[PDB]
Design a protein around this ligand. Structure first.
Ligand SMILES: O=C(O)C1=C[C@@H](O)[C@@H](O)[C@H](O)C1
Length: 263
């Protein structure tokens, strides 16, 4: 039996549901693939190096979560696909001995969104997830505003044509997107009354954290604002990553059916 190794790098990382859904696919598709993948959570120290670790472990591919997506973009050997315009990599593959980066978050997010004609969006956060979502919503022709805590992240969002604010714009937004790490600290990403003001006019409150009711989502729910957590996105982007891990032999829709059900 040929064995290939995979994992997800993050910090923190023990709560990730990738290993479950990817290992289910490796099992299911092992015959088509002619190898058995095995996928593990990898707590990467902040001060380690994603490329060095990838090579040291002998992986054939990896996912990349918080706080590593921008770094992964900087350290990859080659960047392919929409990753180029996201400034973020969530998917690594060893191709012809080169470490190649992809980003499956953009199109995962897109596929998670039922409603096709929101007009504008406010994105909170400036990590790799925020970057991919801005890239993706701009491509769809929404007006995108971005609010974060400092001037870090600015040049990226401005070159994409996003309106970057340094105080909360006093404007209604269709989509309110929490792409901060706040739900992890069990916190709001923004002042409560400010959030309330958005929620009262908004049409969807969208949090990236999956499975659990974050303070961001619980505020939206209390205000009767429609809300959505990261669970459909996580599944779509996993399936797209799997399609890369398979060398484009297993189409993401085949993976998505297995992953959804196991999830
Ligand atoms: O929690 C997880 O395992 C993941 C979260 C997202 O950021 C994805 O970009 C990542 O590839 C997998």
């Amino acid at each position: 039996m040929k064995l290939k190794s995979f994992g997800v790098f993050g910090n923190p990382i023990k709560h990730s549901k990738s290993p479950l859904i990817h290992n289910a696919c490796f099992l299911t598709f092992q015959k088509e693939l002619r190898f058995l993948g095995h996928y593990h959570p990898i707590l990467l120290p902040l001060e380690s190096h994603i490329k060095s670790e990838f090579l040291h472990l002998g992986l054939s591919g990896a996912n990349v979560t918080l706080p590593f997506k921008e770094r992964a973009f900087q350290v990859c050997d080659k960047i392919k696909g929409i990753a180029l315009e996201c400034g973020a990599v969530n998917t690594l593959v060893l191709e012809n001995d080169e470490l190649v980066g992809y980003n499956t978050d953009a199109l995962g997010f897109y596929l998670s969104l039922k409603q096709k004609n929101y007009q504008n969006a406010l994105i909170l956060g400036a990590g790799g997830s925020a970057k991919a979502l801005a890239c993706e919503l701009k491509k769809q022709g929404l007006q995108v505003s971005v609010l974060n805590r400092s001037s870090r992240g600015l040049d990226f969002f401005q070159r994409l044509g996003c309106d970057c604010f340094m105080e909360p714009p006093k404007s209604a937004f269709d989509l309110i997107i929490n792409a901060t790490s706040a739900s992890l600290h069990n916190e709001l990403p923004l002042n409560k009354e400010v959030l309330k003001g958005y929620f009262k006019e908004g049409k969807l409150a969208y949090d990236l954290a999956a499975g659990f009711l974050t303070p961001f989502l619980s505020l939206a729910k209390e205000l009767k604002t429609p809300f959505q957590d990261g669970k459909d996105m996580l599944i779509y982007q996993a399936a797209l990553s799997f399609e890369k891990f398979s060398a484009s032999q297993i189409p993401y829709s085949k993976a998505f059916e297995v992953m959804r059900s196991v999830f």
